[PDB]
From a paper:
The 26S proteasome unfolds and degrades hundreds of proteins to maintain proteostasis, regulate cellular processes and generate peptides with second messenger functions. It consists of a 20S core particle (CP) capped by one or two 19S regulatory particles (RPs) that gate access to the CP proteolytic chamber. The redox-active thioredoxin (TRX)-like protein [name] is expressed in many cell types and was proposed as a nearly stoichiometric component of the human 26S proteasome. It uses its C-terminal PITH (proteasome-interacting TRX) domain for binding, while potentially reducing disulfide bonds with its N-terminal TRX domain but how it binds and is regulated remained unclear.
They all show typical characteristics of the substrate-engaged proteasome, with a shifted and rotated lid subcomplex, the Rpt4/Rpt5 coiled coil positioned near Rpn10, a coaxial alignment of the ATPase ring with the open-gated 20S CP and the substrate polypeptide threaded through the central channel. In PSRpt1, five subunits, [name], Rpt2, Rpt6, Rpt3 and Rpt4, engage the substate and Rpt5 is the seam subunit, albeit at the top of the spiral staircase, ATP bound and ready to engage. This state, thus, immediately precedes PSRpt5. There are four subunits, Rpt5, [name], Rpt2 and Rpt6, bound to ATP, while Rpt3 and Rpt4 are ADP bound. By contrast, in PS proteasomes, the PITH domain gains high affinity through additional interactions of its C-terminal tail with Rpn11’s catalytic groove and a coordination of the active-site Zn+.
Residue numbers in the entry:
A (entry chain J): 2 to 240
B (entry chain G): 6 to 244
C (entry chain M): 5 to 244
D (entry chain C): 306 to 406
E (entry chain H): 3 to 234
F (entry chain F): 294 to 296, 300 to 439
G (entry chain L): 4 to 241
H (entry chain K): 8 to 127, 134 to 241
């Protein structure tokens, strides 16, 4: 009976509502974030179009600022509202301090945006576990993952959404300095990583790559198909 | 028939606001009854003053209050709430005169008093006032007037009304009276109120057992008949 | 049950239970009495010293609302002190707003309305202290008012608040308070109080008195120590 | 409802027009139908008619005759009976009915 | 829906905001009012029957004006009517001071209804349990709108709230010809009430207002008596 | 109360007792007294006119009563002459008298484990925690 | 029963169960003995230590140069009340440029404490205070239980296992008036050493003494500072 | 009686701060030893996965140049207090141009703690060990969600506090050196630790009076451990 | 019904109770008659709480005194991994520990087995409280 | 059960109230917008069509937000007014601030945040109103947007909400036309879909409501076809229907 409020501790010091909140993130599409030497790739799976609705109004990977993109999981209604606030925060800090936002700060603000909602009753937590990736660090690539709890974490590679356990296990054993050593090699890893898509369609994988002092680049469904093909060609070494 | 009740803002399934309903049943907890009879040019209010102690300062045990130089009111119900309703009224009239340049007609003073009671029935902030008010005043262009504002905010124009434990017979007695149309002389009206209160209770009405208020068109001022006069009136009723 | 948890809920029979409970917690207080002499009002309160370690005259229940008014809280003390502070802020705002001492009746009415103001909201509970006000004025005689928790306030020639309310009027009802000057009333208020307070229960006790009238010249200050001594002696001699 | 205990879970939907017509013909086989009694038009008058209600039209169409001491049931004996058996309750309140646009 | 009946800000499992419905019960159990839009104007009627002769029938009037060209008739908790009218006259007024033209009856109901909807969005405020019939003659075409406690405003031609409303509507659809005139309309309106008012239609028992080309006006006891005498 | 079940034997026992109680009139030296801890399950017949009608009400003791009650069950023990039984009552609420004895008996025991003769005030207080099964731990956030 | 979750509900027997419970907070903390003589106000606190190698909890706080208090109850609340007094005295010193008398401070502490007992939204201050200060009307020892009631005490003993400390003081109250500085404190330490379990005896680490006198401000004697008062203390019979 | 910080149990307890206090037990062990030379400070990192950067997990954080922080419990709550800790000490310097004492800061953070139900929320689910050197000397301060702030010669927070504290009581005495305190603390942490102690599993941090710089240990944690 | 048959058997036991000492065990005391729990029949009520840490390391050693464990096992460590665990679930941790040592043919039940044991006996059924929802505690 | 407040998370992570709300759309009237080049249409159903009900607005289900934006509604009446009120005020603010029409999608996001914001702060009931948007902009031309009570929106080429949404949506798929979506084909399908989705047959003209949006000489006329043209529209579909029976 200690789960019908947000600021009521359970007998064992648990914030059960926050624990339930991370249940939404496990029910979104798999979003994997791997940070490379010069291109921090982050992908989205389970694109799952409806065959009669345009996919532009579906975008799940959004660039919070010119140097930081943000791919989320969780419930969409809250994801749009968090991104809008973060986008406004990236510009507002820029005006207050000339230097543009870094990836870690925006994550700290996003985690600061979520946390203030889980702290008090009469307000529901954002149920999104967002992967914050961006080169704006001005030299060092950096990808973070938030948590509807309010804790931001830094991973050299991640997996959020429905299948984090499967993707994450398959990602640790295949991520090495050799793998990240090449840009096209770096993207080949995520495409391989998200290749464990619920149905492994190979056609519902969307990877977006951002490069040092570059601009975001939503891979077109011709370069991805080539990369999906190329990765398939590389995987063709099994026989 | 308790209903959802426990909250004044939650309708019963039938469309009956039980909490407001219970207000009236609190009205007769005062254990007393007041009757107002409108004559040809006068209105007389008679109340029950049952002082249950030889120590009580009889001067301040009155149920009759003077809202304004031309309007007099009697409370039937909880003394504490009736006092607040009296005090709220006085401001409402004084704001009426100060705001429009003339004394507030007895018509509205029950309306504004009723309107105040009505919002306490919607916004679950104030527990409703458990007392009915009767406003008597010599109104220009409309002769003497009587009004009775209930806990739920319903006010009506009464040729004669009575609120208290014995309301059903008091009104039935009056209902028997008003119908055999007669010249309601000031003596007739004052007598009518005394008989109504007497018959229902079955009491002799010793001089001090009641507090009769009187307002007449000739002298449009609220007066409380001094104990000598009620005895004179009472003896007149006997013969 | 169900209707007895919130002060703003009316029982189907039509009453605010919360107020009733508080008025029935005042029954669990020390007896307090008030008698208005022909030119004043007298307050005599039994104070039960709950243990030998509270210094004499502590947590006193006889308060001075204003220069001329008097309070004799009977009931939960902590609630009383709160009611005292509100009264003084009501008086102080009076004298500064109308240039003269707030008449006892109006001080009781405003103080009564405040008390009734707390029996209307669920966010607050009704006051648990019912108090008697006393004052004397050459322009207004002597006035004594009992403000019970519910908000009702009408004056009493002599009243008692506490465990022994019925026992306290009965022996107060046998006095002609209309005439005797509270010079002689203090000897009577003190004599009354000792009749109440059966010794076998409640063990030890102490008695505090105060008066308002000509004798005080319009103030409420405590009866001079000398007067009390004989008064207590005078009441003590009435053991038979 | 787990296979192994209830293997097939057969659904019985309200009959269609070619099903209401068939029902109206299996329960009016013993009836003394006149000529020109279009059992299909009666069926077309009965959208979503349960299937036991269809027999109610046949018992009622026959009940409209026993009150007249006949043995033959005409078309108007039916259409006047497809309104009795296949009756409906409306919300009888515009206040509630526009709650939802 | 069994436990979700109380709170007005918690959807029932079937998507039913029950509390609004129960408020509509309070309307469906109130004084019968009838409205008919005759091609010459709008006629409204309601039964002002008191509980005893002790009442002064002329004290409280149900058929009321808002501006010179709009009036209201209610079937539900009275006192909740008054709070509605005042926010109606103020709203009708607040339109005049800003635009200087009499508020179109469509807008008034759009904002007299939007007043209702305000109280049905938070816990701690009961819904306005009084359905309203609003008559007006604006832009040369009679108008008859019904705003409900639920916040939905209709465009009724002729309806009747309150006790025995189902029967009243059936009498209409029967004796309502879209091509009447205000004179005939008043007779029909009175008759629709006559199907439920349990008693003789005394001139201090039925209160009728006519929303014609010139403006709305609560019929004086006599004229109704002229009307009631004719019908009877 | 009442209830062919197998309780038609106790039902005969009650009606028999019901029978005799009304059988003999007052004025006799056969005054009867019966004790029950649950009077909401007794037959109304058992308490109507000539049966146990003047019903005696036994309350859960008040605070002063508890201070006394805790004394009577402590006389036969060597309780220390400084044991503010009154203070004990304040800490001992919602206590049925029997539980008010449990503190006394527990108080003596608690002294035993400590190897004392006279029951100190503390021993009594520890009983007021062990009579209700509570285990007093010095929680840290108080200081 | 069901009436014992909020201070804003009156129990059938006429009690506000929440305040009764808050009252229970006082007994949780380590007992403090408070006793004033004709010439000084000395209050002794039995400090507790969380662990073997942890410093022992501070029980005697500093309210002003003429008003000091002992806390027996919640740590957070005692701090909140201590902050209020200091701010209250600081304004009192700043406004009237006079030492605010203990009676006036204690009255204000009660008024701030009584609001929580009547308006939902806060919990009763679970801090029982022995207000010790020296004003112009002689030394004083006030105590404010969480029920917002303060009694003018000759000597009082609140805190864990306190009833022993009270029983010693009531037995030796009459002699308290004509006390020298050291005799009064040696009584009080004798009071606290009554509360201690038989095994425990008053050590330099677990007893803190706060004395305020005629020409003396509130000095908080701890660790070695306690020894000068501790030294000469009589051994407990055993 | 355990559904708000506002409800008092019949025994007198706030059954919400306790559950917050229980929330620490689900944390990670952290040990604190205060030595005349300085104060040692260690914590079990408990890396969630090799991918996660060890520097993202902040279990020892620097309040300022002179007082580090050891945490255990809800990360968000501790951060909300830490940032409440970095700011005030800087403020204490700004408004007073001096270094705030450890006892002075731990007063500041706890002042935020005594507000879960003392405003006009929930007891912060973290307790903090504050290590630093001040005018009076070296000094370690520990506080819990309940708001009590107290000083410990050697304290351990988080899970296994009971075992760690008892194993600390035996091995600690007033006369340690910084070198000997660190070794005993690591032996205690390694003893009570679930994984084999090494350079990436735990992180040390020391604050000497004369060496107020280097509020961390970077790659020489290996050297300290290898000599265990 | 026959239930009152059982009840009259208790009332024949309540009368009986009130050199003979009586014990009673009840994992659910709240279902016992208030009369039978009064301090006139059951004068003493011992509460068997969940062990504290210093006892769980003792409950462990009691059940492991016959196990073929490796000399070194940090039972103190295994006591803090079984928080709020009863005196029996500590036993199954010792019984499962070997079963892990029997599944894989090691005749010495090493420490690594126990942590694998405490994951299956205690943690495996304790709560959800998982990584994704446990990266909030550090 | 965890359906007491709109801000309580179910153990599986589902905001039940939002499921209860959006599911509530089922009781509402049916609105559909078909695929169409050089246009897009909305077709609503007048659920309550009683006789005594004077028709004064003629557009009970289709609202015009901006000079080139129209949105229907399917849900609570009260909430529908407040959202349509907030929608227009949002659109006109954009015109005032940028002196440029609000480019469709930013209108939906503005409203969707308002609707979503209710699904976050407690004490406000989740807006139980989905509403189709059609319109044109200089950015992507004709567009269709499907708002949900849970705030989530989405571009669409042909969709139906409310009563029998399943039947309409599938059929709009079954004969779904891409590229070849001329307005005339859209009208025929739109009435064609309502024929079976609307239980009452014959799609009586007054019982249907079509509003079309076209880009004419850069004016963007938003049309609400009058009964006369619907009659011929219903007749146009009616004539086409008979020719299909020739198979037998």
């Amino acid at each position: 009976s200690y789960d019908r409020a947000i600021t009521v501790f359970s007998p064992d010091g648990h914030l059960f509502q926050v624990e339930y909140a991370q249940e939404a993130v496990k029910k979104g599409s798999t979003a994997v974030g791997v940070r490379g030497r010069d291109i921090v790739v982050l992908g989205v799976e389970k694109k799952s179009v409806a065959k009669l609705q345009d996919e532009r109004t579906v975008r799940k990977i959004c660039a919070l600022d010119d140097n930081v993109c943000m791919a989320f999981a969780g419930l969409t209604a809250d994801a749009r509202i968090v991104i809008n606030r973060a986008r406004v925060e990236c510009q507002s800090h820029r005006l207050t301090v000339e230097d543009p936002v870094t990836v870690e700060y925006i994550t700290r603000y996003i985690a600061s945006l979520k946390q203030r909602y889980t702290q008090s009753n009469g307000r529901r937590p954002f149920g999104i576990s967002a992967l914050i990736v961006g080169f704006d660090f001005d030299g060092t690539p950096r990808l973070y993952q938030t948590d509807p709890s309010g804790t931001y974490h830094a991973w050299k590679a991640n997996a959020i959404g429905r299948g984090a356990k499967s993707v994450r296990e398959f990602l640790e054993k295949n991520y090495t300095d050799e793998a990240i050593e090449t840009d096209d090699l770096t993207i080949k890893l995520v495409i391989k990583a998200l290749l464990e898509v619920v149905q492994s369609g190979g056609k519902n994988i969307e990877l977006a790559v951002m490069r040092r002092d570059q601009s975001l680049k939503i891979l077109n469904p011709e370069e991805i198909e080539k990369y999906v093909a190329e990765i398939e060609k590389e995987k063709e070494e099994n026989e | 028939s308790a209903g959802f009740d426990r909250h004044i803002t939650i309708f019963s399934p039938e469309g009956r606001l039980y909490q407001v309903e219970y207000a009236f049943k609190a009205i007769n907890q005062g254990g007393l009854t007041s009757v107002a009879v409108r004559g040809k040019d006068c209105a007389v209010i008679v109340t029950q003053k049952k002082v249950p102690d030889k120590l009580l300062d009889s001067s301040t045990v009155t149920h009759l209050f003077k809202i304004t130089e031309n309007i007099g009111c009697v409370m039937t119900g909880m003394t504490a709430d009736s006092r607040s309703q009296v005090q709220r009224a006085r401001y409402e009239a004084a704001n009426w005169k100060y705001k429009y340049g003339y004394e507030i007609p007895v018509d509205m003073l029950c309306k504004r008093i009723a309107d105040i009671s009505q919002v306490y029935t919607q916004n679950a902030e104030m527990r409703p006032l458990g007392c009915c008010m009767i406003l008597i005043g010599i109104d220009e262009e409309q002769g003497p007037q009587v009004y009775k504002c209930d806990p739920a905010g319903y006010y009506c124009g009464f040729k004669a009304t009575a609120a208290g434990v014995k309301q059903t017979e008091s009104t039935s007695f009056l209902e028997k009276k008003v119908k055999k149309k007669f010249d309601w002389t000031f003596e007739q009206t004052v007598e009518t109120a005394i008989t109504c209160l007497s018959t229902v209770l079955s009491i002799d009405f010793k001089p001090s057992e009641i507090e009769v208020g009187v307002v007449t068109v000739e002298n449009p001022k609220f007066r409380i008949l001094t104990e000598a006069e009620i005895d004179a009136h009472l003896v007149a009723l006997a013969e | 049950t169900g209707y007895d948890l919130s002060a703003s809920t009316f029982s189907p029979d039509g009453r605010v239970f919360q107020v009733e409970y508080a008025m029935k917690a005042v029954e669990n207080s020390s007896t307090a009495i008030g008698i208005r002499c022909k030119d004043g009002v007298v307050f005599g309160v039994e104070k039960l010293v709950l243990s030998k370690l509270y210094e004499e005259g502590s947590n006193k229940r006889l308060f001075n609302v204003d220069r001329h008014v008097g309070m004799a809280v009977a009931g939960l003390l902590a609630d009383a002190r709160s009611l005292a502070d509100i009264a003084r802020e009501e008086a102080s705002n009076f004298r500064s707003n109308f240039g003269y001492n707030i008449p006892l009746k109006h001080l009781a009415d405003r103080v009564a309305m405040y008390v009734h103001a707390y029996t209307l909201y669920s966010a607050v509970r009704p006051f648990g202290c019912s108090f008697m006000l006393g004052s004397y004025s050459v322009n207004d005689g002597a006035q004594l008012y009992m403000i019970d928790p519910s908000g009702v306030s009408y004056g009493y020639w002599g009243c008692a608040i506490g465990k022994a309310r019925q026992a306290a009027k009965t022996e107060i009802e046998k006095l002609q308070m209309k005439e005797m000057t509270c010079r002689d009333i203090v000897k009577e208020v003190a004599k009354i109080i000792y009749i109440v307070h059966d010794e076998v229960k409640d063990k030890a006790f102490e008695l505090e008195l105060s008066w308002v009238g000509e004798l005080t010249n319009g103030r409420h200050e405590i009866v001079p120590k000398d007067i009390r001594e004989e008064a207590e002696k005078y009441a003590k001699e009435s053991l038979k | 409802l787990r296979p192994g205990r209830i293997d097939r879970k057969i659904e019985f939907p309200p009959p269609n027009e070619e099903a209401r017509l068939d029902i109206l013909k299996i329960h009016s086989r013993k009836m003394n139908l006149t000529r020109g009694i279009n059992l299909r038009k009666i069926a077309e008058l009965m959208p979503g008619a349960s299937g036991a209600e269809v027999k109610g039209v046949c018992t009622e169409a026959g009940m409209y005759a026993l009150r007249e001491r006949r043995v033959h049931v005409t078309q108007e004996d039916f259409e006047m009976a497809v309104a009795k058996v296949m009756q409906k309750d409306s919300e009888k309140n515009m206040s509630i009915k526009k709650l939802w646009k | 829906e069994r436990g979700y009946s109380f709170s007005l800000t918690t959807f029932s499992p079937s998507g039913k905001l029950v509390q609004i419905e129960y408020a509509l019960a309070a309307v469906a159990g109130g004084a019968p009012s009838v409205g008919i839009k005759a091609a010459n104007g709008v006629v409204l009627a309601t039964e002002k029957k008191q509980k005893s002769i002790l009442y002064d029938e002329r004290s409280v009037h149900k058929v009321e004006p808002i501006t010179k060209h709009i009036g209201l008739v209610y079937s539900g908790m009275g006192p909740d009517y008054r709070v509605l009218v005042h926010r109606a006259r103020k709203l009708a007024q607040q339109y005049y001071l800003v635009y200087q033209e009499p508020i179109p009856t469509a807008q008034l109901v759009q904002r007299v209804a939007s007043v209702m909807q305000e109280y049905t969005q938070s816990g701690g405020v009961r819904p306005f349990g009084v359905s309203l019939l609003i008559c007006g003659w604006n832009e040369g075409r009679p108008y008859l709108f019904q705003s409900d406690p639920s916040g939905a405003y209709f465009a009724w031609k002729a309806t009747a709230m309150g006790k025995n409303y189902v029967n009243g509507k059936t009498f209409l659809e029967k004796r309502y010809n879209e091509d009447l005139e205000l004179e005939d309309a008043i007779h029909t309106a009175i008759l629709t009430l006559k199907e439920s008012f349990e008693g003789q239609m005394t001139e201090d028992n039925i209160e009728v207002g006519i929303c014609n080309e010139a403006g709305f006006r609560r019929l004086t006891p006599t004229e109704v008596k002229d009307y009631l005498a004719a019908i009877a | 109360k009442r209830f062919k079940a197998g309780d038609r034997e106790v039902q005969r026992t009650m009606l028999e007792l019901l029978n005799q109680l009304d059988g003999f009139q007052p004025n006799t030296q056969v005054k009867v007294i019966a004790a029950t801890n649950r009077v909401d399950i007794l037959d109304p017949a058992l308490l109507r006119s000539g049966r146990l009608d003047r019903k005696i009400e036994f309350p859960m003791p008040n605070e002063e009563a508890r201070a006394r009650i805790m004394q009577i069950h402590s006389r036969k023990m060597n309780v220390s002459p400084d044991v503010n039984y009154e203070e004990l009552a304040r800490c001992t609420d919602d206590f049925n008298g029997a539980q008010c004895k449990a503190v006394c008996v527990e108080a003596g025991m608690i002294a035993l484990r400590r190897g004392a003769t006279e029951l100190t005030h503390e021993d009594y207080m520890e009983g007021i925690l062990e009579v209700q099964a509570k285990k007093k731990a010095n929680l840290q956030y108080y200081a | 029963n069901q009436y014992d979750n909020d201070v804003t509900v009156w129990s059938p027997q006429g009690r506000i169960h929440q305040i009764e419970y808050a009252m229970e907070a006082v007994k949780q903390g380590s007992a403090t003995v408070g006793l004033k003589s004709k010439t000084h106000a000395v209050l002794v606190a039995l400090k507790r230590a969380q662990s073997e190698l942890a410093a022992h909890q501070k029980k005697i706080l500093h309210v002003d140069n003429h008003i000091g208090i002992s806390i027996a109850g919640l740590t957070a609340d005692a701090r909140l009340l201590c902050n209020f007094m200091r701010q209250e005295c600081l304004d009192s010193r700043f406004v009237f440029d006079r030492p605010l008398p203990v009676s006036r401070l204690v009255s204000l502490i009660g008024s701030k404490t009584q609001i929580p007992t009547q308006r939902y939204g806060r919990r009763p201050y679970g801090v029982g205070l022995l207000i010790a200060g020296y004003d112009d009307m002689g030394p004083h020892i006030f105590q404010t239980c969480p029920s917002a009631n303060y009694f003018d005490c000759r000597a009082m003993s609140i805190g864990a296992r306190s009833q022993s400390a009270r029983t010693y003081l009531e037995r030796h109250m009459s002699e308290f008036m004509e006390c020298n500085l050291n005799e009064l404190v040696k009584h009080g330490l004798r009071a606290l050493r009554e509360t201690l379990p038989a095994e425990q005896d008053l050590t330099t680490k677990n007893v803190s003494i706060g004395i305020v006198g005629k020409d003396l401000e509130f000095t908080i004697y701890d660790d070695d500072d306690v020894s000068p008062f501790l030294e000469g203390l009589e051994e407990r019979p055993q | 009686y355990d559904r708000g910080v506002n409800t008092f149990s019949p025994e007198g307890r706030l059954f919400q701060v306790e559950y917050a206090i229980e929330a620490i037990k689900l944390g990670s062990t952290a040990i604190g030893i205060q030595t005349s030379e300085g104060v040692c400070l260690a914590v079990e990192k408990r890396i969630t996965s090799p991918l996660m950067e060890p520097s993202s997990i902040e279990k020892i954080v620097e309040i300022d140049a002179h007082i580090g922080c050891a945490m255990s419990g809800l990360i968000k709550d501790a951060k909300t207090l830490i940032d409440k800790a970095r700011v005030e000490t800087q403020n204490h310097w700004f408004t007073y141009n001096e270094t705030m004492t450890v006892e002075s800061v731990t007063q500041a953070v706890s002042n935020l703690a005594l507000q879960f139900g003392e405003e006009d929320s929930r007891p912060f689910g973290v307790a903090l060990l504050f290590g630093g050197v001040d005018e009076k000397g070296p000094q370690l301060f520990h506080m819990d969600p309940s708001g009590t702030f107290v000083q410990c010669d050697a304290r351990a927070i988080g899970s296994a506090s009971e075992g760690a504290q008892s194993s600390l009581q035996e091995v600690y005495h007033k006369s340690m050196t910084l070198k000997e305190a660190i070794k005993s603390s690591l032996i205690i942490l390694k003893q009570v630790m679930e994984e084999k102690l090494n350079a990436t599993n735990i992180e040390l941090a020391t604050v000497q009076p004369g060496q107020n710089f280097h509020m961390f240990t970077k790659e020489e944690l290996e050297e300290v451990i290898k000599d265990i | 019904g026959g239930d009152n048959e059982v009840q009259r058997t208790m009332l024949e036991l309540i009368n009986q109770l009130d050199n003979i000492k009586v014990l009673m065990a009840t994992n659910r005391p709240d279902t016992l008659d208030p009369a039978l729990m009064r301090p006139g029949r059951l004068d003493r009520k011992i509460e068997f709480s969940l062990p504290d840490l210093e006892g769980r390391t003792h409950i462990f050693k009691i059940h492991a005194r016959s196990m073929s464990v490796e000399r070194d096992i940090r039972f103190e460590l295994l006591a803090r991994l079984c928080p709020n665990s009863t005196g029996a679930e500590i036993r199954s941790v010792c019984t499962e520990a070997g079963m892990f040592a029997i599944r894989a043919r090691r005749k010495i039940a090493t420490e690594k087995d126990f942590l694998e044991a405490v994951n299956k006996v205690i943690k495996s059924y304790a709560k959800f409280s998982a990584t994704p929802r446990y990266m909030t505690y550090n | 059960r965890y359906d007491s407040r709109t801000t309580i998370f179910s153990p599986e992570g589902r905001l039940y109230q939002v499921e209860y709300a959006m599911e509530a759309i089922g009781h509402a009237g049916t609105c559909l917008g078909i695929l169409a080049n050089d246009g897009v249409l909305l077709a609503a159903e007048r659920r309550n069509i009683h006789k005594l009900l004077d028709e004064v607005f003629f557009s009970e289900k289709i609202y015009k937000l901006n000079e080139d934006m129209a949105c229907s509604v399917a849900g609570i009446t009260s909430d529908a007014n407040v959202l349509t009120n907030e929608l227009r005020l949002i659109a006109q603010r954009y015109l005032l601030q940028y002196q440029e029409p609000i480019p469709c999608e930013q209108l939906v996001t503005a409203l969707c945040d308002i609707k979503q914001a209710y699904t976050q702060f407690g004490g406000k009931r989740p807006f139980g109103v989905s509403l189709l948007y059609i319109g044109w902009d200089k950015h992507y031309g004709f567009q269709l947007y499907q708002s949900d009570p849970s705030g989530n929106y989405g571009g669409w080429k042909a969709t139906c909400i409310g009563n029998n949404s399943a039947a309409a949506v599938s059929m709009l798929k079954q004969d779904y036309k891409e590229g070849e979506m001329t307005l005339k084909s859209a009208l025929a399908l739109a009435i064609k879909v309502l024929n079976k989705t609307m239980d009452v047959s014959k799609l009586s003209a007054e019982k249907v409501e079509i509003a079309t949006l076209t880009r004419e000489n850069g004016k963007t006329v938003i049309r609400v076809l009058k009964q006369k043209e619907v009659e011929q529209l219903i007749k146009k579909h009616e004539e086409e229907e008979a020719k299909a029976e020739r198979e037998k």
